[PDB]
Write a protein that binds this ligand. Sequence first.
Ligand SMILES: C[C@@H]1CN(CC(=O)N2CCCC2)CC[NH2+]1
Ligand SMILES: [Zn+2]
Length: 106
Amino acid sequence: NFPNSTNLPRNPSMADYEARIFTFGTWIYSVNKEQLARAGFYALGEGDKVKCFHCGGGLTDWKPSEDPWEQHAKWYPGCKYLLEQKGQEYINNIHLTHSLEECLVR
Ligand SMILES: C[C@@H]1CN(CC(=O)N2CCCC2)CC[NH2+]1
Ligand SMILES: [Zn+2]
């Protein structure tokens, strides 16, 4: 499934922060659930699989050093939720950061 880059959320049932939060339940994983919800993510109930309510972009295997908004920008750069909450300056920063990384680690 392709990522939603329209201004309309793919899962409007999950558009409220309240809604997203309930999906987690007791959360054992290394990334903060409220942080994840704030970044538009709700839990799938399979390991630490989250999905963004707006773009539908899915992310998994959360390391403690990984930020929700950073990972959102990384994999779902076309998400209009992301664009709106963070701004384009932030998204460019994130991209330049990750690309410069993949060329210093590399
Ligand atoms: C949270 C972070 C996400 N990474 C990539 C991922 O989960 N993807 C699934 C769809 C394509 C990118 C793995 C490491 N942990
Ligand atoms: Zn998104």
